[PDB]
Scaffold this active site. Structure first.
Site: not given
Ligand SMILES: NS(=O)(=O)c1ccc(Nc2cc(OC3CCCCC3)nc3ncnn23)cc1
Lengths: 258, 296
Positions: B127, B18, B11
């Protein structure tokens, strides 16, 4: 009365015990004194006036400074640098439009570089382990204010004034929790302006009686009585203006009968 | 910092990037957020001061856990518990079949529980949207990305206006109200509840006035009767078209009587009538709530 006000109050009462500095930290500071700290806080009041900063920002910066000096020996020539970084961090936390780093460099009349200010900012963060959401006198005061019958703006302004004076003098106010100081300040302002006392609804809410507020009340009354002779005067000048209803010009009552 | 093996990018939110990562030594799988500091300019960004300080005290099962802050001089790194997917990807993977109602119920219950905890700890998230809600394989959902969060006061004060993602942004913001509080977060969850039920975003505008019109066209153009004060709000205009309120059984057809009740309370125009996260938990929609595990 907003949705979560009792919950927040309870949580703040939990955090204020975790966010306190060491009571007698100054006594193991080999170079700086309570008197220099008063100069620093007083200057920071001046800074907040100049850049139209929230009073909440002032309160946060002082909390940061006291927590920082609790664990770092600091030399006199670097005291201002700690405070400037504190102010910068408080501004970024609290303000919609924090002043820029170049503006904080500029108000030290170029005593420090931009580099120094950013490095101190980083060092403060480390020492505080990024715990910046401290409860302040100001936060408890605005909550207490909601239990007023009805709103008296002169009481409100005078309580803010008294709560601010407490920032200046580490001895004695470092002994008291923010919720306690706010209570003392709320009662003292109430009494001074209208003659009324710490109301029953606040006793219910805080669990604080006039008896538990006494020691802090006794100190704050002295502070209030001697405010015009104090070495530091920025707060008294601040609260002389019409925006604060000139509350610092009012006479402190001679006795409190407590 | 050397113990971490970056796997991939997962992300890019309000600030920084991230990654999915593994502790070389313990084998724990984590999410690694990278914030560049490139010294010369402005110091640590306020977006990070806020996110880290707030998250340090937002420890709850329905909020993503911050495990560590690794603070070099060139970069700043945040270590979070790893979640495998966001609600957006999950909603796309069940465009056809729809998410089963028990799962909707439970996710909503959980999101409300996490949001109540925030509001009750005087934090506004500001958000909420499907890509900021993270799910694991066990049935949990968690609030993530607190980059745009802040600590509010009692009573509130003017806060930043440029706030919330367009599709999820409450009308008091669009119309320019001096003040907003916890109600803006509830509006976003209302939008999200609806999106979970129908497969499509509820109000997908592409400008502020388009967003307004889209809300109006569904909920009816607001007036003094429904929202005392609208017509005297700074960006309210008398020339706004007057659309009639659409019926909820057409806005959100799969929902029963309880769900429409709940959805209409999250989507009241007047922020003072908008239900609270804690009060919502008490709603009859949730009496038969379970913890379903997705076919994931
Ligand atoms: N694109 S996805 O396969 O649906 C996906 C989305 C999210 C994640 N994991 C994730 C993504 C993420 O990204 C940040 C910045 C983007 C918005 C969400 C928070 N922060 C996180 N903190 C713990 N897991 N995590 C992994 C895969």
């Amino acid at each position: 009365v907003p949705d979560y006000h009792e919950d927040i109050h309870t949580y703040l009462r939990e955090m204020e015990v975790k966010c306190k500095p060491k009571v007698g930290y100054m006594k193991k500071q080999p170079d700086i004194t309570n008197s220099m700290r008063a100069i620093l806080v007083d200057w920071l009041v001046e800074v907040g006036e100049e850049y139209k900063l929230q009073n909440e920002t002032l309160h946060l910066a002082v909390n940061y400074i006291d927590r920082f000096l609790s664990s770092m020996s600091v030399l006199r020539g670097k005291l201002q640098l700690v405070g400037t970084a504190a102010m910068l961090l408080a501004s970024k936390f609290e303000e919609i439009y924090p002043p820029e780093v170049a503006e904080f460099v500029y108000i030290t009349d170029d005593t420090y570089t931009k580099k120094q200010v950013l490095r101190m900012e980083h060092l403060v963060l480390k020492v505080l382990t990024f715990d910046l959401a401290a409860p302040t006198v100001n936060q408890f005061l605005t909550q207490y204010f909601l239990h007023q019958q009805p709103a008296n703006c002169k009481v409100e302004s005078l309580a803010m004034f008294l709560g601010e004076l407490s920032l200046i003098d580490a001895d004695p106010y470092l002994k008291y929790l923010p919720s306690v100081i706010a209570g003392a300040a709320f009662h003292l302002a109430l009494y001074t302006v209208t003659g009324q006392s710490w109301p029953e609804s606040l006793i219910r809410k805080t669990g604080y009686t006039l008896e538990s507020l006494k020691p802090c009340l006794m100190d704050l009354h002295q502070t209030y009585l001697k405010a015009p002779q104090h070495a530091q005067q920025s707060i008294r000048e601040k609260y002389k203006n019409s925006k604060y209803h000139g509350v610092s010009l009012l006479n402190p009552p001679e006795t409190l009968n407590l | 910092m050397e113990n971490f093996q970056k796997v991939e990018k997962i992300g890019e939110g309000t600030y920084g990037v991230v990654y999915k990562a593994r502790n070389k030594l313990t084998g724990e799988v984590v999410a690694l957020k990278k914030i560049r500091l490139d010294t010369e300019t402005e110091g640590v960004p306020s977006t990070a001061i806020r996110e880290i300080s707030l998250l340090k005290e937002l420890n709850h099962p329905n909020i993503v856990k911050l495990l560590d802050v690794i603070h070099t001089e060139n970069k700043l790194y945040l270590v979070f518990e790893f979640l495998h997917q966001d609600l957006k990807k999950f909603m796309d993977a069940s465009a056809l079949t729809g998410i089963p109602l028990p799962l909707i119920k439970s996710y909503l219950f959980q999101l409300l529980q996490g949001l109540a905890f925030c509001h009750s700890h005087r934090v506004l998230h500001r958000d909420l949207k499907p890509q900021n809600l993270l799910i694991n394989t066990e049935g949990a959902i968690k609030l993530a990305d607190f980059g745009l969060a802040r600590a509010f006061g009692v009573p509130v004060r003017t806060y930043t206006h440029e706030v919330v993602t367009l599709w999820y942004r409450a009308p008091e913001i669009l119309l320019g109200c001096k003040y907003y509080s916890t109600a803006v977060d509830i509006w976003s969850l209302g939008c999200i509840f609806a999106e979970m039920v129908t497969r499509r975003a509820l109000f997908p505008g592409d400008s502020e006035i388009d967003q307004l019109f889209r809300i109006f066209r569904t909920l009816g153009t607001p007036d003094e009767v429904v929202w005392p004060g609208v017509t005297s709000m700074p960006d309210y205009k008398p020339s706004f078209p007057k659309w009639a309120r659409q019926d909820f059984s057409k806005v959100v057809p799969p929902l029963d009587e309880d769900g429409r009740s709940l959805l209409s309370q999250m989507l009241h125009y007047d922020p003072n009538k908008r239900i609270s996260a804690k009060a919502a938990l008490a709603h009859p929609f949730f009496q038969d709530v379970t913890k379903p595990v997705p076919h994931l």
